[PDB]
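User: Can you write out an input/output pair for a complex, sequences first and structure second?

Assistant: Here is one pair. Inputs:
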Amino acid sequence: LERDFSRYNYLSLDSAKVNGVDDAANFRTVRNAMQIVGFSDPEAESVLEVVAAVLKLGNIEFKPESRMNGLDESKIKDKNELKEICELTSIDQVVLERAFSFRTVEAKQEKVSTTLNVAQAYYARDALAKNLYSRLFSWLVNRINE
Amino acid sequence: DEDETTALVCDNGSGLVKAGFAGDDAPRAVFPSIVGRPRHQGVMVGMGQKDSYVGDEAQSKRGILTLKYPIEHGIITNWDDMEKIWHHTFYNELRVAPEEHPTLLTEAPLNPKANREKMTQIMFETFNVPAMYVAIQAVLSLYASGRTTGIVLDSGDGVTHNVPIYEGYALPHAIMRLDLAGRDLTDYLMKILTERGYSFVTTAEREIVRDIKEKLCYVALDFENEMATAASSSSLEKSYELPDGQVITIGNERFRCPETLFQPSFIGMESAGIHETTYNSIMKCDIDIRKDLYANNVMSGGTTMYPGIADRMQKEITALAPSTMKIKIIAPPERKYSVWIGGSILASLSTFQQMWITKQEYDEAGPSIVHRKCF
Amino acid sequence: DEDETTALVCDNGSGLVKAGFAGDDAPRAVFPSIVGRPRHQGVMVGMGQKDSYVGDEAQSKRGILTLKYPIEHGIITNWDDMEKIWHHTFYNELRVAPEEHPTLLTEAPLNPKANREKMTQIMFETFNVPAMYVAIQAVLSLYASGRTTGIVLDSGDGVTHNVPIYEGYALPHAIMRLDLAGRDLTDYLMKILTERGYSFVTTAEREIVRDIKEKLCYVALDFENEMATAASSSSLEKSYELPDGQVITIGNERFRCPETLFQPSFIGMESAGIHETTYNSIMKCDIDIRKDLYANNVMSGGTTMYPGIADRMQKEITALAPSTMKIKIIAPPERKYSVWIGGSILASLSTFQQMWITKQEYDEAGPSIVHRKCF
Amino acid sequence: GKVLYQVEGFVDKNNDLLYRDLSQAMWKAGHALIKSLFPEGNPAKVNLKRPPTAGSQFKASVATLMKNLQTKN
Ligand SMILES: Nc1ncnc2c1ncn2[C@@H]1O[C@H](COP(=O)(O)OP(=O)(O)O)[C@@H](O)[C@H]1O
Ligand SMILES: Nc1ncnc2c1ncn2[C@@H]1O[C@H](COP(=O)(O)OP(=O)(O)O)[C@@H](O)[C@H]1O
Ligand SMILES: [Mg+2]
Ligand SMILES: [Mg+2]
């Protein structure tokens, strides 16, 4: 993770500071709060890897290509961010790289990979981020309720 | 059964029944539309032999059956056999009650009237569906295409047809129907395999030739250059192991089989070909539509899963179309199911739910109700 | 909306609605006066198809519409369609409330009485404008001309008309009205393009021929010299790329299309022509006016945007007028909007503000109030 | 009262398109937490119908809450 708030797609410089509230003290308040409610010490770091992933997905952007003729392929402009997330989440890079631009239509016994355009690549990226953070949040609620 | 009462989409086009629920990206049941009946005596007592085997089971037991497609060229010809196909579709493959699910049947454009009327009669009277809707198949291919503007061909097993649509409006005076499709290419491949020396005449052997067509055939770009290329050497000659026996070795038949789809004089059918019925279907539209058709030429159905049919298609249409036009052949890898997939998208629309043909109004009006409410 | 309550000027002449606020040098809304209605079935469900498309949107979607001009020869013929044109004018293009802005409508001289009466009825009763004023269009062209003395012709899409004015005083006994304008030249260009070999008969193709007329036609000075020049070689022959297709190549039709405006026997209309109705409109005035008319012959409206119509006009009138007269054809490049622009200048006058026809006196007198207070 | 809704961005913020290969792709993770988050990601069972759109998800959540509040006082 970088540390400047202009360096992230989901954030900006214009929202970095509530005038009277600092984020570090509340951060230590949370990590002190997780010890009472049963969250273990590698467990909270394992959750912060997921929150790190949700922050880092937004820096992936897409461009169109000429082959094939239709439907038109999208590709990643630069895969530094893909390499950092795929090393971070312990996923092979061909799996997620193929998982941005294509989708398998799987019939009764037969499956095929088809192209998504640029806009639907942004919707699959946005939906992957907020669905990942959402199911993380619901899992935290289940872990508290355990 | 199903947890919901979500509507069914049953694409039963001409040679491969594929069906499922609405909202799915792929059909849950894909099986060939065959009815096999035994032609030999049952000599083993108490085995459990049936009267007729349907679909995939008839494809397995095909060595002792005769295989009858109940639907040919998009027209249902054996209504009791097609009743077995639908009964196997809802009750065996999907395992669902049709009385709780609306069904979305597909037909081809320019079909007989008694096809859709009697299909409506069997859907409401025999299976007792709550609502049905018969829709033109290439329109559904344009739903899964993600476009409201484009000319579509699907090329099923019995019928290929161009439907040009501009801004959501059908152009029914420019719909082309050509009765040349994959079953005719299977029969022509049986003829030219008989030319090489392999005699397939049995309906099971016809399915073997269909598997040769699906696995080894491809569309040439220049038929005389690939023809002289195969005449030059053994570069493109590919071998196929037959079911339960020897290995055949086929050469130019790989591209002479689907070239009939571009040159219908091979099977003796006087027509213009798939590229020229596409171009004539474009030219029978209004003029200020035409470039939007050329930029959205959709080739998104069945038989057109050959390798190199999009390059041949863009070559022939680009040769026919005037210059400074952008000809774009939309040929996704979602083909062979996109007519179903757009069936799922059409059934999943909210404003579509008034366009179902229900009971009570079928029961008011009779089987002509589709000619009121279907296109 | 608008920051002020500045009066609107809505020039809706016969074929091109152009409108805006007073005090502007150019109208903020220019769109063709068409209403397109779909003639084909809507086959895509839930797209967002409308009942009728108005103006520029109907010009875009014209491939699947039929186009109906609600006003022909300066006379409104479809009042519900013209209500759609005005509703689109105030609410869609200008995006303003007509209850807060006075409106300045334009008509042609020698019009039907129920035109201005029912136009007044729709302005006050349907749209609820606070004040309106219907004015003769060529008088407004003389406002933007910067003169109080001159004879004016505008030549819209449906009507050309000469209004001679001397020292601010109208000469209404010498007003000429000729119902020969750009839509008739479009139809005659459709006929002679059919003569060459290009068959345009569709209303969308009629708009294509209108675009050919606007882009490639010009007025010859000597029709037989340019006619024999085009008969000599391919010097003046110019090509036009059609919308969504091939390239046409037109020759003498470039100058046979607007020569109908000088020789109305081409379209079979028995009249004197635009130069001879201008000259007869001069000669029907008093004698000591006439030279001031010749020095201020104003040609400042619509159809007369052809290349070389001012030279042909000065040639024909100078041939008709006696010698030692200074014939000056005032033809600015501010044409096709100057009838609107003088609408803005007339609406921006201080002493004009008592001449508006308001409520309360329309509400006292009824729709004949224009025949009290308009010319 | 008459609440004014700005229509800028409704379609971009209703789209919840997450499909099969994303849940499979994160199911094949070496991180056991992310694999624990996505039980739908196994290719050894079919991935059924997708819970798109997000408005139907929120309608489903409010419907769940109203099935919660009805059996209570
Ligand atoms: N991979 C393939 N390549 C060539 N031909 C194929 C291929 N798959 C299917 N076909 C042919 O297309 C036919 C099925 O077409 P389809 O569009 O599924 O028709 P239906 O309308 O009945 O759904 C098959 O029966 C077969 O002849
Ligand atoms: N550049 C041009 N050359 C020739 N004719 C034109 C040109 N521009 C417009 N026209 C013709 O003039 C008509 C526009 O006239 P206009 O005065 O705008 O009509 P209105 O009286 O409705 O304002 C169009 O219908 C078109 O046929
Ligand atoms: Mg089908
Ligand atoms: Mg005008």
